[PDB]
Amino acid sequence: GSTRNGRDSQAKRLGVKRYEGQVVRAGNILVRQRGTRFKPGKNVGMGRDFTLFALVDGVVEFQDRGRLGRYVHVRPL
């Protein structure tokens, strides 16, 4: 008796890193994701693996714009 299965991969620890109303510095990572679950909004960059991070010091805000997707922003302090 034997298994032709057995394997799985290392977990990747994805998801939101900073929640709305939290104060972040320029560079802080905000959301780690596979594809654009959330989209970069004002003051928010997106890296080659979809990682949303803050472009300026300030405060996080989320916005759910329907068929336009969900967005993350940073508002200047």
Partner 1 sequence: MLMPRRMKYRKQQRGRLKGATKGGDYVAFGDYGLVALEPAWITAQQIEAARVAMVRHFRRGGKIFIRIFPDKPYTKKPLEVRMGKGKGNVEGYVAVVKPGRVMFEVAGVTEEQAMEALRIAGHKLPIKTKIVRRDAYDEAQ
Residues that bind partner 1 (CB under 8 A): 1-3, 5
CA distance 13 to 8: 15
The site partner of 73 among Mg ion, RNA, partner 1, none (C-beta below 5 to 8 Å per kind) is Mg ion
Query: What is the per-residue DSSP string for 32-75?
Result: E-SS-SEEE-TTEEE-TT--EEESSSEEEEEEE-GGG-EEEEEE
66 touching RNA, by CB under 7 A:
yes
Residue 3 vs 10, nearer CB to partner 1: 3
- Greatest CA separation for the chain: 64
**Pattern of binders to RNA over 9-48, x per CB under 7 A?**
xxxxxxxx--xxxxx---------xxxxx-----------
List of residues contacting RNA (CB under 7 A) = 1-16, 19-23, 33-37, 50, 62-70
